[PDB]
Amino acid sequence: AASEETLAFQRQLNALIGYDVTDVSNVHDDELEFTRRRLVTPRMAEVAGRDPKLYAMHPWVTSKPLPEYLLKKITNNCVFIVIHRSTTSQTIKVSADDTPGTILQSFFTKMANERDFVLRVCGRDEYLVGETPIKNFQWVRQCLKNGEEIHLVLDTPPDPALDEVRKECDRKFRVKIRGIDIPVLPRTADLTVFVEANIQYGQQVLCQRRTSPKPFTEEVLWNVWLEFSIKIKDLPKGALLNLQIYCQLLYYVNLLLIDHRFLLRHGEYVLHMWQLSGFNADKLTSATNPDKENSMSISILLDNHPIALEMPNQLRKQLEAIIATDPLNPLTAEDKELLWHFRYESLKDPKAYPKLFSSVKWGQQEIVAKTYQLLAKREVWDQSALDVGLTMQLLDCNFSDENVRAIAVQKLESLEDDDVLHYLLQLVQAVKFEPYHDSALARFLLKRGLRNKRIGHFLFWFLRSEIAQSRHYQQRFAVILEAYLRGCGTAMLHDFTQQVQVIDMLQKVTIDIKSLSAEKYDVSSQVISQLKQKLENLQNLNLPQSFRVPYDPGLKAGALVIEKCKVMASKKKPLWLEFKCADPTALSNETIGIIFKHGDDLRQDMLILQILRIMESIWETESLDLCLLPYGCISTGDKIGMIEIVKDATTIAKIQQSTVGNTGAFKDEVLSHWLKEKCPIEEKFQAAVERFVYSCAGYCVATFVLGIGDRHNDNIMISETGNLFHIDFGHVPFVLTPDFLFVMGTSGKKTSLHFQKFQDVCVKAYLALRHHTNLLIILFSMMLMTGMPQLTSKEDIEYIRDALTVGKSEEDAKKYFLDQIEVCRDKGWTVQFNWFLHLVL
Numbered sequence: 157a158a159s160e161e162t163l164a165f166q167r168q169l170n171a172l173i174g175y176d177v178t179d180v181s182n183v184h185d186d187e188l189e190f191t192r193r194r195l196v197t198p199r200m201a202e203v204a205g206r207d208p209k210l211y212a213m214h215p216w217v218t219s220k221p222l223p224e225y226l227l228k229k230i231t232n233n234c235v236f237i238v239i240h241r242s243t244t245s246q247t248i249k250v251s252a253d254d255t256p257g258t259i260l261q262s263f264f265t266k267m268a269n270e271r272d273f274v275l276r277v278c279g280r281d282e283y284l285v286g287e288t289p290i291k292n293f294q295w296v297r298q299c300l301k302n303g304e305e306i307h308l309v310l311d312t313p314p315d316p317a318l319d320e321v322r323k324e325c326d327r328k329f330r331v332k333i334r335g336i337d338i339p340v341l342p343r344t345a346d347l348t349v350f351v352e353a354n355i356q357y358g359q360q361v362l363c364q365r366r367t368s369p370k371p372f373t374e375e376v377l378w379n380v381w382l383e384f385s386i387k388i389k390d391l392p393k394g395a396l397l398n399l400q401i402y403c404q405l406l407y408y409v410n411l412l413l414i415d416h417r418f419l420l421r422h423g424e425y426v427l428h429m430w431q432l433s434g435f436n437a438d439k440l441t442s443a444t445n446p447d448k449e450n451s452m453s454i455s456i457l458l459d460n461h462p463i464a465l466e467m468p469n470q471l472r473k474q475l476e477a478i479i480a481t482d483p484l485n486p487l488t489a490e491d492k493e494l495l496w497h498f499r500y501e502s503l504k505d506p507k508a509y510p511k512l513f514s515s516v517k518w519g520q521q522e523i524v525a526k527t528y529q530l531l532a533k534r535e536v537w538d539q540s541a542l543d544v545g546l547t548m549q550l551l552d553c554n555f556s557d558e559n560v561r562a563i564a565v566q567k568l569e570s571l572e573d574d575d576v577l578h579y580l581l582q583l584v585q586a587v588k589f590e591p592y593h594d595s596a597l598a599r600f601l602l603k604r605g606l607r608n609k610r611i612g613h614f615l616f617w618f619l620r621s622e623i624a625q626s627r628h629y630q631q632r633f634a635v636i637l638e639a640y641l642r643g644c645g646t647a648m649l650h651d652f653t654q655q656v657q658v659i660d661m662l663q664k665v666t667i668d669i670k671s672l673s674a675e676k677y678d679v680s681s682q683v684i685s686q687l688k689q690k691l692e693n694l695q696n697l698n699l700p701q702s703f704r705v706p707y708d709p710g711l712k713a714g715a716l717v718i719e720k721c722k723v724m725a726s727k728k729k730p731l732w733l734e735f736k737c738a739d740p741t742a743l744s745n746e747t748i749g750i751i752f753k754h755g756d757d758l759r760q761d762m763l764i765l766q767i768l769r770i771m772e773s774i775w776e777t778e779s780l781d782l783c784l785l786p787y788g789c790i791s792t793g794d795k796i797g798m799i800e801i802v803k804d805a806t807t808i809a810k811i812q813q814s815t816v817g818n819t820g821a822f823k824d825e826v827l828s829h830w831l832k833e834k835c836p837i838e839e840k841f842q843a844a845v846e847r848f849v850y851s852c853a854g855y856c857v858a859t860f861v862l863g864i865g866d867r868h869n870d871n872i873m874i875s876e877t878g879n880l881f882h883i884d885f886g887h888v889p890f891v892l893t894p895d896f897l898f899v900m901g902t903s904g905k906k907t908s909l910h911f912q913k914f915q916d917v918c919v920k921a922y923l924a925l926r927h928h929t930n931l932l933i934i935l936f937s938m939m940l941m942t943g944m945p946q947l948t949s950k951e952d953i954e955y956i957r958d959a960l961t962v963g964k965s966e967e968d969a970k971k972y973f974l975d976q977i978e979v980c981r982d983k984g985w986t987v988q989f990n991w992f993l994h995l996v997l
């Protein structure tokens with residue numbers, strides 16, 4: 157039995173999730189339900205312990221110091237803020253150390269609990285509340301950087317009652333391979349086929365056995381016992397039995413040998429397989445293919461609980477040569493032995509943990525034993541200061557051991573909310589490397605999401621993103637999302653519903669509109685009146701009147717402005733939508749622009765954009781502001797999603813087309829001429845030129861390190877404020893064309909004033925990233941493994957190593973980047989003209 161209401165609840169949950177989590181149709185064990193049942197406690201333990209008030213106003217703060225760029229603009233010890241009562245308003249100087257209370261307890265003495273209000277950000281759902289210095293608020297810091305006033309408004313604190321959560325042996329190992337079955341055969345000359353079985357741990361193969369090659373029929377039997385050299389008692393918790401079909405790898409499937417319950421896996425199994433799209437997180441999944449009618453299946457038998465709990469010389473000082481912090485530097489049998497033999501000496505240094513645990517022989521019970529003793533005393537580690545870079549490497553595909561991974565997650569615990577937001581996307585992707593559905597990392601994410609609405613809002617869209625287009629991982633992520641959705645609150649549950657409703661309706665339009673004309677780029681007037689009408693059709697009584705903007709939670713969107721909506725003259729025929737701001741206190745009339753697009757895999761864009769945000773914080777710790785513009789983007793489904801529209805900005809390519817020919821030979825003057833005219837007032841033009849210098853640099857260094865600098869002009873944009881920024885990330889060192897150089901004041905290839913400033917920044921920016929080589933290397937490799945198709949592991953990943961110029965000394969590095977800036981100088985328009993040709997051919 158089950159209370160109708162409850163049943164109805166779980167019904168909406170699944171609607172939010174985008175998948176039916178109750179489904180037990182696709183599970184060969186009760187790990188999903190078991191997990192779906194185990195998270196209930198940690199979730200309820202979070203809801204109960206959080207402060208309903210601070211949770212309702214989700215203050216966004218940071219405990220870091222104000223970088224030079226920000227502090228300098230405070231050479232007054234204080235700062236003022238315009239407070240809006242009603243249509244009223246008054247300025248009040250305040251010191252950087254004032255508390256939100258000391259701000260009102262003071263503001264009221266100037267006019268004259270009597271003070272039953274709170275400070276919110278005009279036209280935003282952002283509150284300055286709690287025992288924190290106003291200088292430690294994110295909003296404040298951003299206003300400072302963008303030299304803007306801090307317009308706040310007096311209003312009543314939200315009611316926490318809106319967030320209330322609804323009511324509740326010893327012999328060797330062997331496996332019998334019975335056979336492979338598939339309904340339809342792939343018309344391909346008819347080849348041979350054999351099954352490969354691997355015992356795998358942390359992406360390493362411990363033992364491997366094969367069957368005899370037979371003709372590729374539709375039912376191929378073997379009934380052969382494959383015996384491995386490993387002994388049951390030596391199978392580590394978290395090992396997988398990888399089953400592959402070859403002839404070229406065609407299909408694969410995995411099965412955890414030791415289950416969530418610590419029991420060896422016995423029984424007959426019929427496992428449905430994944431097909432190779434043509435290394436990455438997907439090949440590691442324990443999920444089976446749900447397409448049980450069309451998929452290849454393999455049948456096996458398993459039949460044989462256990463698991464359930466002097467100071468060296470120069471030699472050892474060569475161990476330090478190995479601990480060369482090179483994440484992408486493999487280890488030799490010799491290297492590993494050295495590391496393991498001198499274990500305890502290696503333990504006295506955190507930066508060597510990854511290398512040390514990768515020298516462990518996980519396939520030997522007795523050794524795993526000593527490892528667990530080595531961890532028993534985590535002094536050097538527990539006392540060490542957090543290093544995300546080091547922590548992330550311990551969460552990647554190379555480590556399957558729960559305790560090793562648990563210490564990494566232990567360090568994450570130290571992260572303040574603002575830091576959890578910079579790495580959240582990558583931590584959610586790292587869940588794919590966990591051997592079991594329930595893990596310390598799945599728990600950490602659940603918790604921080606339940607404790608802070610901002611993180612929760614994002615955890616939600618990152619999880620949903622994957623649930624929607626990832627068969628390999630959607631079950632595990634749904635169970636994680638459901639557990640979050642049973643604790644976020646009724647208010648958020650409502651917000652999520654309105655947002656889900658809106659995108660589900662807008663993408664339907666996006667695609668339908670795409671069919672009407674996915675061939676010729678001739679955007680007709682009818683397709684346009686068509687879009688409008690469709691929008692009118694929804695605007696009626698279906699489309700939610702208002703909703704929070706998925707990539708910017710504090711912004712509230714209202715009615716669509718049908719008059720400004722259009723279909724862009726782009727291959728993908730993206731929709732360009734504009735909405736009003738639902739908030740009356742909005743200190744402006746500017747609309748909220750959002751592009752909806754079908755055709756590009758926006759998950760790659762989400763990953764690039766977040767990396768970029770991480771670089772900005774790295775540069776901040778060093779007091780540098782490259783003016784990047786990592787606009788919001790959220791991947792909603794397979795090749796579909798939304799993009800934040802950066803206001804009054806244009807493509808660099810379009811600029812060339814307007815002045816000069818839309819096909820002719822690009823001109824230099826073009827860009828600067830466009831800027832001058834865009835912002836007449838000679839005082840604003842100067843500043844624009846200043847932005848263009850730093851932003852241009854920021855992107856050149858950023859894109860260069862990411863191996864993504866060579867792109868067409870059409871994928872680069874500029875604001876009427878001088879900000880340059882790259883866009884539309886689908887997948888010469890970088891783009892620094894004559895027109896860019898021109899804006900900096902440089903004809904031919906000589907004179908250089910602003911060019912001087914340019915060079916300087918690039919270097920200081922480049923060498924600032926090098927101080928974080930290990931962090932950038934695990935991020936770059938995790939990105940490739942979780943967001944790119946079948947990659948060239950370590951090969952595709954060996955690029956960033958050269959780009960960061962590992963080993964080489966700073967000065968030599970400085971010169972290496974300087975030469976890169978030079979290769980562009982000599983190339984000029986050659987590359988662009990070729991890209992144009994390419995789009996022509």
Ligand SMILES: Nc1ncnc2c1ncn2[C@@H]1O[C@H](COP(=O)(O)OP(=O)(O)OP(=O)(O)O)[C@@H](O)[C@H]1O
Nearest residue numbers: 726727728730753787799800801802807871883884
């Ligand atoms: N973040 C943004 N801010 C403002 N305008 C944007 C943004 N992203 C894209 N655009 C606009 O959308 C257009 C690019 O759209 P989109 O990226 O969908 O094109 P595409 O056909 O997919 O790309 P390509 O052919 O270069 O691979 C440009 O005309 C640009 O002005």
Ligand SMILES: [Lu+3]
Nearest residue numbers: 176178179181
């Ligand atoms: Lu169902």
Ligand SMILES: [Lu+3]
Nearest residue numbers: 185186187189
């Ligand atoms: Lu059961």
Ligand SMILES: [Lu+3]
Nearest residue numbers: 180185186189
């Ligand atoms: Lu069951």
Ligand SMILES: [Lu+3]
Nearest residue numbers: 180186189190
């Ligand atoms: Lu059951």
Ligand SMILES: [Lu+3]
Nearest residue numbers: 746747803804
């Ligand atoms: Lu405007």
Ligand SMILES: [Lu+3]
Nearest residue numbers: 803804805876
């Ligand atoms: Lu404008």
Ligand SMILES: [Lu+3]
Nearest residue numbers: 746803804805
């Ligand atoms: Lu405008």
Ligand SMILES: [Lu+3]
Nearest residue numbers: 726870871884
């Ligand atoms: Lu484009």
Ligand SMILES: [Lu+3]
Nearest residue numbers: 756884885886
């Ligand atoms: Lu594109």
